[PDB]
Design a protein around this nucleic acid. Structure first.
Ligand SMILES: [Mg+2]
Ligand SMILES: [Mg+2]
Ligand SMILES: [Mg+2]
Ligand SMILES: [Mg+2]
Ligand SMILES: [Mg+2]
Ligand SMILES: [Mg+2]
Ligand SMILES: [Mg+2]
Ligand SMILES: [Mg+2]
Ligand SMILES: [Zn+2]
Lengths: 196, 129, 157, 80, 150
RNA sequence: GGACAUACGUUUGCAAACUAAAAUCGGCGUUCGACUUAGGGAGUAAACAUUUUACUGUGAAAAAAUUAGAGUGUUCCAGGCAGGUUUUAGCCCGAAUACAUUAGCAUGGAAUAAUGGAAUAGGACUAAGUCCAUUUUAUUGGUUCUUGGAUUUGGUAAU
RNA sequence: AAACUAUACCGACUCGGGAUCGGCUGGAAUAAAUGUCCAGUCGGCACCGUAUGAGAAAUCAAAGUCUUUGGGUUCUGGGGGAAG
């Protein structure tokens, strides 16, 4: 539907499927009705995960308007499950973040809130992708020359949902951001006082 | 309290190479601490290094090759016209062969030497040899 | 009756119109001396529709402004249309290769037009000697807030 | 010889709260089930006060430096 | 470690890594905001309110859940504790000292202790006044303290 | 240094570099070509990026002195002269340059450092309405209107 | 006042080791003790061993990370006697 979009002009074959696909789920499943009623879309981008295997395995990332970001996270799990079943493609939800300029300030009486800065915006997606579960440890490495590798620590109990998307994420990030992102699984680090 | 963590981090590190530590954990870290680090790294003094995300202000771990002889900062970071250079080169560096007096410019941070290339330099930051 | 007499014994303008204006009984008679020192400076709205007779003003008189232009914080509001601005700069010390703090005090004349307040940044121009100290007139005033001591306040403005 | 980036779990489990890398607390949260009403209330591992069961009004926990002793036989799961 | 050339250590408290709200808990920011302001109305310190929400209703870190710091929540809802805990309390004991001193006009260790405590209060005033978070004409002398006693 | 990538600017005028359409011209509606409007880089100049510090760079910092180029004052101090009559009623060549910190001016700037912008609220951008002020319209009125400022409202923005 | 550690305060680092005083967390035996022990660990006197680190040395885990001379700040000295 052009309904579930903000620009409301024209959609792309991908964006279109996503629209009806969404409208589908709120009619089909009674539970996602409430949440999906709310959800609006900003834009959707498709990315090809090209591996040396000459295999074409694509997935698509969808930009949920910030207004519905709360809601999007509220049912995030179930939503992505159905969208992947109903589109046979890998699905990722992000927030539509607007980045502010560093030196291009123009409104004398306007300060650039850190909330919308490049470090913080680009760092956002990573949380968004692995979505269902947020990371435990994040790190940076400086290869001699000057590369920066982000080996990120992911929870063990989530090996399911995250192991698969794992390659897509890497590839979407390298495209949007510019950051190489390798992951590493570590058993969760429960630190409490076991007391028998 | 604390001040010029670049100094905090720097000596903690020297104490490392000097004691023969195999690697170092620098507690309070900043952009500066890191830039300086990749400048030493780039010139080949320190080895690979990792920045852990302390949700407050990151902690860094630097591998120790074994070539660092000394790396400190300089008290107030005086200003230094390009004309003020030899003064400091003969002053801080152990020779006219290990030129590494890091400075801050408007053109960022350059090696004692690079500043002559870019032709500007400005305030002193630290040194390593 | 107020702005005119108010103690002093008379207050006209540089352009002695007035009483004669009663000759042009139709158009606009209420003329006041109008000017524009220029130099990238706006002429105060308040300056125009005022009743004030300040000969020492840079918009209501044949008082020029030339060369030296200043920006400094204000110290005192006392004195009749005169204020003291304090500038805060650093001085270098050849030997120790460092600086010390220092402050010059300046006698500034204030045309009624702009409204003062203590502890605000002000912009002065270089006007001819108006008195022993005075040699600067206010041209642009910026209001600012300092919670307390003006002396404590030291800014490399 | 030890790696400072991939430190042993035990080691870090011994160290002092603030000495561990990522640095996390020891405190935890627990669902307590009264010895009567049964009501399940959440209580913090380091309660700084006496706690009553909002159902009846029984006594569940006594405050101490750090630990919170649980009154009599009440149930407790460690939510995590 | 404040006014102490010799004594110094580490009390505790280290916010866990994971910046999100605990799993087990469900509470629209609003839900909490009610408890917070309700609790506050009863006459509570944002300092104490947060304690309850942790000990009682398993809410470790209201800030992490709302995206709002307690005192802010409170100020937005008119339920703002006039004078900050900081100053308030210092002045409280600062006062308690004075009362005790009276009947013990000879207790010197206490004269001293008060000197330190009154010293601090002048340090907060300097601060809280500079953040236009307290009228400039504020002055703790003996009347500012007894003024709050009424 | 460009460009592009949610990414250091916007307007102007110039120049412009290529492309998408429409026109005209030729051959046989189209294959193609030359020539027009639109389009930004790039290419300059003015207006903007909170305010300084600090650094670049040039304008200014008298001469003599110090450094220093040329130059066999018999070497030299040092002067600034001198070199070739074999074009000799004339020829050749010189009197250079640098340093000058501290404060002022022009100006390039991304680091550190300080300073500042939207938190009572209000801000921002935008449209309309209303009120005050106002340039050119010969001039004076009255309307309107351009241009500043004041508010109210509604829209937009991850307020 | 030999008001003495004759050794300014704040801060970061770097050797080994047990024993302490205060608090905390796990555990074991008895027992079910405001006790005992084992193991951690913050914070506090102090000691033991040792330094291809410091010094004139006595000695110093800091009197160390200062010719490889620069974390922040306060106070003090400049041959002796006459003299505090
Ligand atoms: Mg200061
Ligand atoms: Mg401490
Ligand atoms: Mg651009
Ligand atoms: Mg025990
Ligand atoms: Mg023990
Ligand atoms: Mg010595
Ligand atoms: Mg010893
Ligand atoms: Mg020294
Ligand atoms: Zn009960």
């Amino acid at each position: 539907a052009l309904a579930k979009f903000h620009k409301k002009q024209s959609l792309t074959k991908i964006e279109e499927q996503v629209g009806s696909a969404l409208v589908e789920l709120q009619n089909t499943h009674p539970d996602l009705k409430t949440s999906l009623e709310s959800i609006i879309l900003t834009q959707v981008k498709e990315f090809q995960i090209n591996k040396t295997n000459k295999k074409a395995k694509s997935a698509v990332l969808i930009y949920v308007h910030f207004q519905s970001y709360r809601v999007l996270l509220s049912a995030a799990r179930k939503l992505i499950i159905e969208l992947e079943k109903k589109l046979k493609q890998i699905v990722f939800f992000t927030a539509q973040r607007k980045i502010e300029s560093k030196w291009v300030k123009e409104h004398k009486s306007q300060q650039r809130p850190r909330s919308r800065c490049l470090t913080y915006v680009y760092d956002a997606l990573l949380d968004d992708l692995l979505l269902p579960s947020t990371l435990i440890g994040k790190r940076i490495r400086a290869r001699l020359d000057g590369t920066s590798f982000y080996r990120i620590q992911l929870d063990q109990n989530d090996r399911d949902f995250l192991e698969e998307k794992l390659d897509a994420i890497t590839h979407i990030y390298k495209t949007v951001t510019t950051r190489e992102v390798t992951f590493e699984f570590k058993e969760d680090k429960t630190f409490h006082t076991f007391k028998k | 309290v604390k001040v010029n963590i670049l100094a905090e981090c720097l000596k903690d590190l020297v104490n490392a190479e000097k004691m023969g530590k195999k690697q170092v954990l620098l507690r309070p870290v900043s952009k500066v601490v890191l830039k300086f680090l990749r400048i030493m790294q780039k010139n080949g003094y320190i080895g690979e290094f990792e920045v852990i995300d302390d949700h407050r202000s990151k902690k860094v771990v630097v591998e120790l090759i074994g070539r660092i002889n000394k790396c400190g900062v300089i008290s107030p970071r005086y200003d230094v016209p390009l004309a003020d250079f030899e003064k400091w080169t003969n002053n801080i560096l152990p020779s006219r062969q290990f030129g590494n007096v890091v400075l801050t410019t408007t053109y960022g941070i350059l090696t004692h030497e690079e500043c002559r290339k870019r032709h500007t330099g400005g305030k002193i930051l630290g040194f390593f040899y | 009756m107020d702005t005119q007499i108010q103690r002093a014994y008379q207050k006209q303008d540089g352009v002695f119109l007035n009483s004669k204006k009663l000759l042009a009984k139709k158009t606009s008679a209420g003329v006041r001396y109008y000017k524009n020192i220029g130099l990238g400076f706006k002429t105060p709205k308040e300056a125009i529709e005022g009743t004030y007779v300040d000969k020492k003003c840079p918009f209501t008189s044949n008082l020029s402004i030339r060369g030296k232009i200043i920006k400094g914080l204000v110290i005192s509001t006392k004195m009749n249309r005169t204020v003291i601005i304090r500038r805060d700069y650093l001085h270098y010390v050849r030997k120790y290769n460092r600086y010390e703090k220092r402050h010059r005090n300046i006698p500034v004349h204030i045309s009624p037009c702009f409204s003062v307040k203590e502890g605000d940044i002000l912009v002065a121009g270089q006007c001819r000697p108006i008195s022993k100290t005075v040699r600067f007139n206010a041209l642009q005033v910026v209001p600012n807030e300092i919670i307390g001591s003006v002396r404590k306040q030291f800014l490399l403005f | 010889e030890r790696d400072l980036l991939n430190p042993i779990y035990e080691e870090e489990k011994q160290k002092n709260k603030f000495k561990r890398l990522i640095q996390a607390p020891n405190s935890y949260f627990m669902d307590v089930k009264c010895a009567q009403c049964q009501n399940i209330q959440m209580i913090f591992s380091n309660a700084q006060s006496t706690i009553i069961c909002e159902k009846c009004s029984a006594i569940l926990c006594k405050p101490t430096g750090g630990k919170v002793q649980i009154q009599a036989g009440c149930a407790f799961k460690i939510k995590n | 470690m404040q006014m102490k050339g010799k004594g110094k250590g580490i009390s505790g408290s280290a916010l866990p890594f994971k910046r999100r709200s605990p799993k087990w808990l469900h509470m629209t920011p609003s839900t909490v905001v009610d408890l917070s302001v309700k609790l506050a109305k009863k006459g509570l310190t944002p300092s104490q309110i947060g304690v309850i929400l942790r000990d009682q209703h398993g809410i470790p870190q209201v800030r992490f859940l709302t995206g709002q710091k307690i005192l802010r929540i409170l100020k937005k809802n008119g339920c703002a504790p006039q004078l900050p805990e900081d100053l308030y309390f210092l002045i409280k004991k600062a006062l308690s000292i004075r009362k005790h001193l009276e009947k013990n006009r000879k207790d010197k260790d206490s004269k001293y202790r008060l000197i330190l405590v009154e010293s601090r209060i002048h340090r907060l005033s300097r601060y809280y006044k500079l953040n236009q978070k307290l009228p400039p004409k504020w002055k703790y002398n003996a009347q500012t303290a007894s003024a709050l006693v009424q």
